[PDB]
Assembly symmetry: C2
Homo-oligomer: 139 residues x 2
């Protein structure tokens, strides 16, 4: 409940299995309250305007986030995490890519389709600049 | 055939222990001279990258490390570097060349951790991001003696 949409946009992501493919994916990031505990939650939803069976999501609470900031050396707290992610996605690189090969979003699919890994990057002159990778589960 | 690629005085945050037998490390902002040079190994002829840290405050303050391609591969692995050994110095140096137009008319970005016996010091370089400290790499430098 108390679901506030913070980001809802179609992005170009390169999909992986091991042949790569740049495809359009809908990413939704929203704020919600856990029904039993009332605690703040962050929900990530990935879907495709073509594949209807392509539905993945993950809900993060503060505990789940601590694992994510441990694995990716994030210094931002759970509250600021979506603000800096959404700022990166919407405000930072306003570069239009002509579509009738590098991507800042990588999606790695499971052969069984039980999940997928959603990866966000901010390239640097010396590294790929991985921000975080989140495991999204089949809906 | 040693060539100095970078030679500048930088502000670093220095951590040094009270003693070899005590937990306490005290922290200081201090000016250190960093020198990055390229050279050829005398026996093998292979390309080497040398890092040297010194400071006018203490003639006994002399640390260095020489990286060859193999040593670098370990460093690249530990810090997820995607640039090759040849490009590494050019990129790091281009990063360090900082025109601060902060014409006044304290985040450091360099951390140095010392040994109690002064046998080594860990040199760490950072480029802050909105979500992280942005560690570029850390290099263990050894006492020059």
């Amino acid at each position: 409940t108390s679901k506030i949409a913070l980001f809802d946009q179609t992005l170009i992501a390169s999909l992986l299995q091991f042949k790569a493919y740049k495809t359009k994916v809908k990413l939704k990031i929203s704020e919600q309250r856990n029904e039993t505990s009332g605690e703040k939650e962050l929900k990530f939803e990935i879907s495709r305007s073509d594949d209807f069976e392509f539905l993945f999501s993950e809900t993060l609470n503060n505990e789940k986030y601590q694992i994510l900031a441990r694995d990716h050396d994030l210094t931002v707290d759970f509250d600021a995490f979506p603000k800096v992610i959404i700022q990166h996605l919407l405000c930072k690189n306003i570069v239009k890519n002509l579509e009738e090969k590098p991507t800042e979003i990588n999606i790695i699919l499971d052969a069984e389709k039980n999940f997928c890994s959603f990866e966000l990057f901010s390239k640097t002159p010396w590294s790929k600049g991985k921000i975080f990778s989140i495991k999204l589960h089949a809906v």
